[PDB]
């Protein structure tokens, strides 16, 4: 429906932070990427504080 | 005694393989070196049977 | 696409080449068991390509399905074609692949994908050991 | 101890290939049920009874040999006590029968057609046992060529 439009809509949102970590993270390394990470997690939405609390979730052990 | 012995124990497998219990020869050298204390034995046959349902709880 | 498709196969020449001859007497008695569970993981690997090709025997199989269904394979897959490179390149008997392996186990610890594999590997070649 | 024996007693009914935390429940479960029925005829009449049921099923050199035992053993009470009470639920040519030609000077009956009979039936057994297990074999295996892919492999899992 509507040529593939509302299909690919809510992954835009998501890939809109997705591209924003690669791009922060980009010529940090070590123990500066549990602290960019943790940076990010903090949003004010569910949307993206289930989906960094899941990259930190990975990033803890 | 220990001729005597070693040949009741030989003669004590095949009634228990006759009769269709899941002992093997571990096993009943287990439950013989068990009975010898003194247990009663229509006690055991309840842990045995739990053991082997438990057993297949896990796999 | 298709070269995104081609790291399967190039990950499956270099491990039978393992399998299909390293694992001789003369190679020590530690070849061996490395390829008795690598073997294990080459026939589960035809297992899934057979799998496949039933359902493209039912026009059901394109490049998309048979993309996403790859990715299991170059994940795990690539993995063995690392470890197998390096094993194999240097006179590992013994010891000394015990200790790539322990090696090779901590380069994985913080993917868990491969971990459990690499630990896998190496707890069958420390059987003879 | 006895308690101990019951340690041994999980050890040998669970092998080994988790593995530690596995031991311990069980040590429960074997110490858990001892104890209910101690809160709430000779032994050989028994082994006769058994032994009735066999023969009633046929197989009459069984019955001859399970009386023959007991019969040398009364000629260890207490574990004979316990196969009487573990009794199934576990894991399980000749020609001097139906052949007359060989012994010396064999009976005389005139012929047979009737144990002859139920003597292709004790190869029909075997015949049906082991067309079972390639029943069995192809079925395990088709059980892996057709379904959808990696739904018996773990591999998608990684």
Known sequence: ?61 | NLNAVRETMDVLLEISRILNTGLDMETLSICVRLCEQGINPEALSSVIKELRKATEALK | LVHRILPVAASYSAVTRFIEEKSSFEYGQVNHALAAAMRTLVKEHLILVSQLEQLHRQGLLSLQKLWFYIQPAMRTMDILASLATSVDKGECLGGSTLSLLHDRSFSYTGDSQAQELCLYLTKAASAPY | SITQLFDDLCEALLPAANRKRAKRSLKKVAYNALFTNLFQLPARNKILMLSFDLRVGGLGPKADRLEELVEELEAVGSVLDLLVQLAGSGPPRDYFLNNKHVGRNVPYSGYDCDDLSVFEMDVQSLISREECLCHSMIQETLQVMEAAPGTGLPTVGL
């Open chain 1, 1 to 61: 429906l509507r040529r593939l439009l509302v299909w690919t809509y809510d992954p835009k949102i998501r890939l809109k932070t997705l591209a924003a970590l690669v791009d922060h993270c980009q010529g940090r390394k070590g123990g500066e990427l549990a602290s960019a990470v943790h940076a990010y997690t903090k949003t004010g939405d569910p949307y993206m504080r289930s989906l960094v609390q899941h990259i930190l979730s990975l990033v803890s052990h």
